[PDB]
Paper text:
Ctf4 forms a homotrimer that has the potential to connect the CMG helicase to one or two Pol α complexes, via the α-helical bundle at the carboxyl terminus of each Ctf4 protomer, which binds to a short conserved motif in the GINS component of CMG and the Pol1 catalytic subunit of Pol α (Simon et al., 2014). Here, we identify new Ctf4 partners in addition to Pol α and helicase, all of which contain a “Ctf4-interacting-peptide” or CIP-box. Crystallographic analysis classifies CIP-boxes into two related groups that target different sites on Ctf4. In addition to its role as a bridge between the CMG helicase and Pol α, our data indicate that Ctf4 functions as a key hub within the replisome, linking the helicase to a diverse set of partners.
The first of these was the multi-functional nuclease/helicase Dna2, which plays a role in the processing of Okazaki fragments during lagging strand synthesis, and in DNA-end resection for homologous recombination (Cejka, 2015, Kao and Bambara, 2003). Inspection of the amino acid sequence of Dna2 revealed a single peptide in its N-terminal region that closely resembled the Ctf4-interacting motif of Sld5 and Pol1. This sequence is located within the minimal fragment of Dna2 that interacted with Ctf4 in the two-hybrid screen, and associates directly with Ctf4 in vitro when fused to glutathione S-transferase (GST), in a manner that is dependent upon residues conserved with the equivalent motifs of Sld5 and Pol1. We then used non-dissociative (native) mass spectrometry and fluorescence anisotropy to show that an isolated peptide containing the Dna2 CIP-box was able to bind directly to Ctf4 in vitro. Encouraged by these findings, we soaked the Dna2 peptide into crystals of Ctf4 471–927, using the same approach that we described previously (Simon et al., 2014), and found that the Dna2 CIP-box sequence folded as a two-turn α helix that bound to the helical domain of Ctf4, in a very similar manner to the CIP-boxes of Sld5 and Pol1. These data indicate that budding yeast Dna2, Sld5, and Pol1 are archetypes of a set of CIP-box proteins that all share a common mode of interaction with Ctf4. The dna2-4A allele was viable, even in the absence of the Mec1 checkpoint kinase, indicating that displacement of Dna2 from Ctf4 does not produce significant defects in DNA synthesis. Interestingly, however, pulse field gel electrophoresis indicated that chromosome 12 was dramatically smaller in dna2-4A cells, whereas other chromosomes were not affected. This suggests that tethering of Dna2 to Ctf4 at replication forks is part of a replication-coupled mechanism to maintain the large array of rDNA repeats on chromosome 12.
Numbering used by the authors:
A (entry chain D): 207 to 219
B (entry chain A): 474 to 663, 671 to 791, 814 to 927
C (entry chain C): 474 to 663, 671 to 776
D (entry chain B): 474 to 791, 814 to 927
E (entry chain E): 207 to 220
The structure:
């Protein structure tokens, strides 16, 4: 779950 | 000691009859031995803007500096300089620098508004782009000069201190120093390349201002050194921002080479414009290859640890996030200092800084995720403190939730609340 | 010149198979050559405060620094460091420092919030107490490092003017230099104690901050030098506030007893916490005598 | 390194039995070996003002400094100083400077209001005209001291930093610095192995640093004169970030021009003081580079910016004649520097002699007038760009008008319009 | 015409 955080990282924009 | 005529990225003659006088992001200037005279060829990288030309050197110019508006030529022994504007609209002009017993011109530099001449006795002669002298100054013996607009980066050498540097501004009024003869921690040289180190004893392959106005030097140790915080004298630090030996080592898939070398031209934000020299000697040959680009990398990678992760080099994402964090941190701190004091220069600095801070948090959050993986609540909290955007503090809370660390979540939410209450003062 | 791995109040192996890595007012750290690896022991003087422990050193650490919260270990050739907090609550962490050809870690230092690594090429790598890199700085070659809170006192060596010192604060804003490679007024060394001056050619027995923030250094001339008023670069002065060569003669009341040498640990306001060495060797051996103090 | 007792313009004994202790614009102090004692003679250049006197030195004074109100004598080894006021009003007084193991007094200096003693360990001991001690300060080892009124110019030398300088004021309470241990870019001597039989080696053993003299100018700017025979002046010393050492006189070049372009080997300059734009000096003719006995009458050498080339000066001649177009560049530069220096003086200290504002006015006048000749030459060669940059450096608005009229006579109406824009821009900034 | 500008230089005085 923690290895792929692009779902969280791309929400910052 | 013998001071030698210096020019950015100049090469020696070696066993040939031609060398490069100087070389940067604008182009390259070569000279060819022609019986008893010389044939100088000024060439450009943007062929659309300027037209390559050549002329006959009846003096033996061994000093040169190239900018976007003109070319400056210097003769170290006779003291004769010449400035040739690229456009034929503006006229060429020639001066003869007075030289005392054994005094040599050691470095010349030119911007669209200033012409700089440094000698081995420490004479600092400045002119405008038309040859009108402003003032003669005596400093420590000068070994290298570069300039940009109205600012000058000078390297000095005594028998006492070694290598020092000065950073000054030649404003409309008078000359002001930002830094005066501070220590220059560039590694001196310690052979097939003996021809080079007789031609350039210090091993200063090139030195230049960055595209954003920060002083940079490239020594024989092939490490790009950038001067940080030069506007605040007590905060100045030289930061190694590129181990080009390592980048070549990583390009070659971990294999040690002996025939690939870097020749520095300029630094544009995060990219080192350079020439990749393949051959027995470390300096470029004829014809000159097309310039390459080498992205700067903080020297934090270990060869031992990089070989294991492969078993072109592949970098583990967790390790590349640490380097990307450091690199974004340094670049962001440098660009903010520029914008806070000098403003913009190219038109994209505000956008670059925005995307830079974004990449900072994103890389920092990856390190945060790795720390939650290892159940390292303490290390994670320290990482979250270094986050910039508040939207990234939220992203850390959501990462902490996916790791089921409710103790961490509350401590990060205290950070968010503390920053919100500074928004109220 | 040979850059030798330095630690505060460290002793050489000599002819024995054990020595002291570092040593100060907190405690002493020894290492022992066993069959194949090494055995590092971390001991304390206030035994009622910290738990003494030992571990097997598979790497051969020759660099150490001890503070009131943890112990920093360093290997000068492989570029490997390790920080072990005294409290079991916090994790041990390990990191490898990049090293070019012939580059050696020459000194390490740590505080509750900072970890410092210096090399023979002038690299200055700082971290927090968990191993997160903060900045990589390029200075003159580093030979000795010490730190306290956010301050750092670094001794450098230039090919030209010799030994110099810098004093800086790694604050939360940015690093700030109070002194930048200024003259270090220390006497270089002038046997049975010949094994030592190969282990430490610069003769710097130890260096530390006083309990009130001033940098201190203890040269081979056995004189405690203190840097006063460094916050004002105009009034900065180095003061020889203690000549232990005379304090032994004055306290003994007898004659010049060459059986007594002083080993400095730290300076705490009014007393010099130190170790009094009895023997031919000027460096302490095993067992370690009780710490004594010296009025200023 | 061996610190040697220094005094402004002092000469060594050499192979004689007499030397000059110190020497400046006021006069000269000589000492003669007298069996086992010494005969010191204080002489003046204005024979009307002061009366030459002499006395017997039973101590061996090797340090001296001369001002307009008294003479200071110093003994480098015993640490004994003595101040002899010229006038009988105040009595002579003597002190013994504390000296440690191997500590030597390296330089003494005195003004009518201050007495300064510097040692080889860097001790800076100051007193007033009567001998009342000021606070004692520890600095870098001092090699040379000069002073003027309440301000002190000190030169320091470590094996670490090299050659530095400090510029301070000795106020009523304590010492305040204008500049502290900034780099002193004076060229050190380059001694060879053939110089071990040279006739002038005696000098560089008596003064290893080669500081022939150092002094404040008549307008209060620090000056130093090294073995390279170049007069260095410190400009902008009131603004630390702007301080610059400016070479304003290549005396080897002036001698080369006095001799009609011919290289000489027997004429040398010995610096006394700097008066506005003229270097008071002694022209030494002989085998040695320092003056001997008797002393010639002082000469005057006008400062000249080192911008003249020997090659280009020989061609224009084919006493050296200087082409008007080439002399305009040097006259522009020199006026620019002098005007910049005098303006700083008046804006911070005011006048000191009573005629400075007139000097600055005529100076700025010569600045524009020299600048306008450079402007005319640029219009001659149709170099509109170079001319416009020259016009921007003009000071008086009435000189901008003279440029417009010169541009009209050159038939450059585009330039005329651009010069009148400068007048408009300056009128606009005078109101904003 | 440009060689002799003393007629112009002396007008500055006023």
């Amino acid at each position: 779950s923690l290895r792929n955080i692009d779902d969280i990282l791309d929400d910052i924009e | 000691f013998r001071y030698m005529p210096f020019s950015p990225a100049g090469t020696p003659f070696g066993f040939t009859d031609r060398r490069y006088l100087t070389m940067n992001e604008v182009g390259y200037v070569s000279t060819v031995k022609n019986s008893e005279q010389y044939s100088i060829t000024v060439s450009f990288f943007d062929v659309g803007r300027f037209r390559e030309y050549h002329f006959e050197d009846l003096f033996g110019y061994d000093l040169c500096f190239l900018n976007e508006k003109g070319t400056l030529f210097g003769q170290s022994k006779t003291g004769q300089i010449q400035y040739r504007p690229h456009d034929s609209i503006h006229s060429n002009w020639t001066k003869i620098i007075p030289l005392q017993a054994g005094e040599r011109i050691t470095s010349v530099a030119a911007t669209p508004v200033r012409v700089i001449v440094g000698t081995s006795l420490g004479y600092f002669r400045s002119f405008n782009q038309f040859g009108v002298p402003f003032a003669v100054e005596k400093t420590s013996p000068i070994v290298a000069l570069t300039a940009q607009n109205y600012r000058v980066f000078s390297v000095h050498y005594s028998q006492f201190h070694g290598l020092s540097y000065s950073l000054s501004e030649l404003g409309t009024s008078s000359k002001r120093y930002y830094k005066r003869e501070c220590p220059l921690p560039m590694s001196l040289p310690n052979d097939a390349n003996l021809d080079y180190y007789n031609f350039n004893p210090m091993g200063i392959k090139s030195l230049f201002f960055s595209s954003y106005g920060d002083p940079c030097i490239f020594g024989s140790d092939n490490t790009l050194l950038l001067l940080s915080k030069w506007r605040s004298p007590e905060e100045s630090k030289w930061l190694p921002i590129l181990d080009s030996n390592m980048e070549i080592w990583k390009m070659s898939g971990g294999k040690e080479t002996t025939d690939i070398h870097v020749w520095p031209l300029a630094l544009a934000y995060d990219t080192l414009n350079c020439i990749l020299v393949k051959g027995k000697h470390i300096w470029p040959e004829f014809p000159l290859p097309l310039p390459s680009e080498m992205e700067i990398r903080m020297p934090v990678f270990v060869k031992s640890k990089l070989l294991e992760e492969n078993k072109e080099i592949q970098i583990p994402v967790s390790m590349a996030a640490e380097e990307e964090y450091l690199r974004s941190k340094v670049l962001s701190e440098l660009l903010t200092d520029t914008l806070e004091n000098d403003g913009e220069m190219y038109g994209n600095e505000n956008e670059v800084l925005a995307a830079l801070n974004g990449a900072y948090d994103k890389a920092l959050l990856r390190l945060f995720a790795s720390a939650c993986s290892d159940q390292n609540v303490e290390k994670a909290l320290s990482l979250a403190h270094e986050l910039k955007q508040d939207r990234a503090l939220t992203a850390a809370v959501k990462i902490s939730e996916r790791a089921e660390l409710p103790s961490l979540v509350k401590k990060i939410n205290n950070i968010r609340e503390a920053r919100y209450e500074q928004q109220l003062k």
